[PDB]
Amino acid sequence: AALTRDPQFQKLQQWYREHRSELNLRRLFDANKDRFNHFSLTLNTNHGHILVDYSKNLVTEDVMRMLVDLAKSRGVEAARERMFNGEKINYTEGRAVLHVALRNRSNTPILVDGKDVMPEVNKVLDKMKSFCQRVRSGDWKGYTGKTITDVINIGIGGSDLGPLMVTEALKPYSSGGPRVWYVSNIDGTHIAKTLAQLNPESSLFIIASKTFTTQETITNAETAKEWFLQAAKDPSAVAKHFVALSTNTTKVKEFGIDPQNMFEFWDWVGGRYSLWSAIGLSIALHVGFDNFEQLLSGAHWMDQHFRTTPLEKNAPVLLALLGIWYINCFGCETHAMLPYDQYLHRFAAYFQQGDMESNGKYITKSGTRVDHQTGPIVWGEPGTNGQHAFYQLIHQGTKMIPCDFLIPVQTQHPIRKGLHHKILLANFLAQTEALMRGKSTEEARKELQAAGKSPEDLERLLPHKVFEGNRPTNSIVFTKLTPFMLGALVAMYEHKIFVQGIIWDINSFDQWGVELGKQLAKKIEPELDGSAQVTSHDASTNGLINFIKQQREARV
Amino acid sequence: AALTRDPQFQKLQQWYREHRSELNLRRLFDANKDRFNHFSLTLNTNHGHILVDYSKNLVTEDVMRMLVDLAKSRGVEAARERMFNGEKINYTEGRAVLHVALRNRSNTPILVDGKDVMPEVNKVLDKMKSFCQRVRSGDWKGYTGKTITDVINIGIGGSDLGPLMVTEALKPYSSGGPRVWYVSNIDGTHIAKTLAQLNPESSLFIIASKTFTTQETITNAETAKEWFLQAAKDPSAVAKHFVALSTNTTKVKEFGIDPQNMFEFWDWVGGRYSLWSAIGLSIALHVGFDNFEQLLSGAHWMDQHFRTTPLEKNAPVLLALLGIWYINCFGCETHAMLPYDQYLHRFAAYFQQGDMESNGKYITKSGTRVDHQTGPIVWGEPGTNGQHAFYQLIHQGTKMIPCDFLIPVQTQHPIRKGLHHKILLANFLAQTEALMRGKSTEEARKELQAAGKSPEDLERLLPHKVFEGNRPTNSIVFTKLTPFMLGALVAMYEHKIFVQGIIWDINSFDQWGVELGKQLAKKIEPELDGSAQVTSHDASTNGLINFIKQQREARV
Ligand SMILES: NCCNC(=O)[C@@H](O)[C@H](O)[C@H](O)COP(=O)(O)O
């Protein structure tokens, strides 16, 4: 791989191997009095501030210098320009990568195959706006002439997780919008338990699918259509209760959806970057097109910040480089995203798709296998809940986990005169601090003595109450979680992923594993029907199928 | 540490270092025709079957022999007996570990301080049963004489995640039960968005807290009580709408809860093992006490299976030992739990608490630091959704992740004459297979040629569509996800965790980490009030607080 061959990478690996033991957070904070100032970024978006405090990380002045040097050496700025200019950086599929275009509020031209994509981008948005205004008011009526109370998105993966996470995150902005439902799994539970709660007279179905061929989405869409027509009995009513979000015009019309009920997007819109496109119609229906514009505007601000800011002060760039430092030097397999916000319960899950589906690769731009670590395993749950659970392994486990702590300063619900948010903020701060400093053998001994413990019981219990500390955190604090701020935060991580993949020399925009998954369950599918034994596969698969066939009619 | 010193452990490490390259799944399955039979367990509970297919793992006959040898050498059977007999195996806190007692349907005596715990266990269950029957029918009325339509659990961690996961998993058994709500986070969003949907005339609040001191739970409980009394105006009505689940009798009465509205449990009931106790009152209210009995009965079956089965055929034992093999030899930081069931969406999250809060340790039984890896990072999301996302890093990443695939044979919703479940089953099977076999350079070349690709475009795209394979899976197939089967499945993993912690010589039942978290916020809490700058902490913490104080009075 090209990365292991790089001179700045080898310089960074050499420093790490020599000065690893001298990287102590408690020792560094009382050495450099202005460490916070030297290792933090204040971003003013004019719609809220973002503090990216990376001072609780295992870096000095020299380490950040070398990491910035690697970004230049791997050609991050050049690669960035190729993306924003509309060049075909998704080489494996022969596609541009333009999620940035979907939110380009400046309307500055972006050229794909000598043609500006912007007029078509803005046209779909206009169609979205009109549709939303029509549905949300009551202008768009059902087959019985009833106003839409329920919006149902049928889609999986990128055609699901984006709008799900965003509608959950921006829930208090959904006043006077219809309820949103998200059917994704093939599991009949998902579609069945949903339809049992809906009335077909006042329900709108959205068939979110880029290809419009995906088994899960199409099957779920056909079931809903069958469920709807069982009560309506009129094929003409489908044009009132069904809309599609796709690139494939032929497949949409073939399904039975009116060609004027289709909201287009393009192949340079990857699934895990599609919420910004027509895929976000469910978001725009829930919180309104105004808030959806604000969402795109926030992302736009972050795109502009990423493109114009020097690398040493660039937010997604610095976050990405801290990642490289822990993955390719410290050996960290994981990266934890811990939002101190209940609206952001699906945030960690969204970037579990976003990051892992992008940087979960092993083949370079040339075609050679990598001889270094690529993308991490991304996971997390909102605070404070995690403190009472997995934080135990973070504080006292045997594995290093770099964490991203995130929190709005202002809460959507300032109940009890701000008492709940005050505790939430206090906990946010205290936890990052505790991970940094810890509790020594002497500090634990003094605490046990004041409470009341005998020298025989105290000494046995002593090492168990000791916290080694020296665990790295990023503290990302923002003014308020508004549509705009969420847009900026999502886009920040989008480019964080992008920068990492460029350094690793991998394609962050192909998905050959998920492409494989869409073909696999066609070989096994016919072999499940009947009661006859299967031997066409390996010993494991065969045995599994025969067990399934056996247990199929068993009374329990 | 005692583990690294063990002779069987060193024998296993030596085999791994010599015969790592000879462990190829494709090579093994066409060598041993009956590999499935040699590496799988069929368990008949008489309330459904469980197939634990561990044949897709990187083990031979010799490896399983050595792993069983390590279990004996570390004294797993002896330690097991100490737990079930009521001995104080939670040495650090001086407590027994008896979640197994809470579900002991045989009623065989278990002695703690020379006294049988069973009569007190069964007494709380009787009180639970009566209360449930009273509430679910309509016998227990509100302050306005209205029947309870809404049940709200206020608790965090172990006082939350168990009942949440179980009520979500057993949702189709909740017919004629009240709706269940789960408030956990201190974040005022959680409590506020809930109360906005409830009517205080028909709402029952459950204050789930072992200690009854926890800041999150108590604050959330006080807010709900204040919200209730704002509409009721009578302190006597609190005895009609508020109940407590605790060990502390004094704290419950102090809060204002009637002493006859308390459902007791004990200190040998750890939070992450408390769903079985009075903590599961929300479960019993939702699906009924009969189904809650079935849940405990299923766990009981699994406890009995764990206690009586020889180690080489024991389910939690084998699953635990495969974990040790990947963590302490292969170096795997993570373990993925992937249920192919939409009712089990919180299953992976529950064991993220269960496993990580138990085995996230670094100090032995003696007090010495470990010189080996302990518990993994546990994560996952339900199938098939994951296939379109993070499975990319599982199939083509640079990190080894052992996966547990789980699926019921029978579905709660067999819609479209079983079409949805057929696809779900097909996908379950095809994915575990693909991870095992993969796709070679020649297999990928032949597929691209049949579709239609030029020799110049085909060769550039070829290495990117190649799957190395040789990725381990466990396929756990069960007849149906019923209250009983869920109980067995949860208990299976409970003991899996237990066996692992015994081999590592750590205390799987202490939680210094979470106990630290409950004290940390006290120092920062008063320093947040006002607009004055803070300098009492380190540079990072100080800067963070001053940013918060600044953005407090911004308007967006
Ligand atoms: N087995 C321990 C599991 N993990 C925990 O102890 C915490 O999550 C515990 O459940 C919560 O902190 C709740 O505390 P309380 O129940 O009010 O005393």
Ligand SMILES: O=C(O)[C@@H](O)[C@H](O)[C@H](O)COP(=O)(O)O
């Ligand atoms: O990340 C992805 O690309 C996947 O999650 C896809 O979004 C998913 O396969 C949906 O299918 P499509 O959008 O192609 O209809």
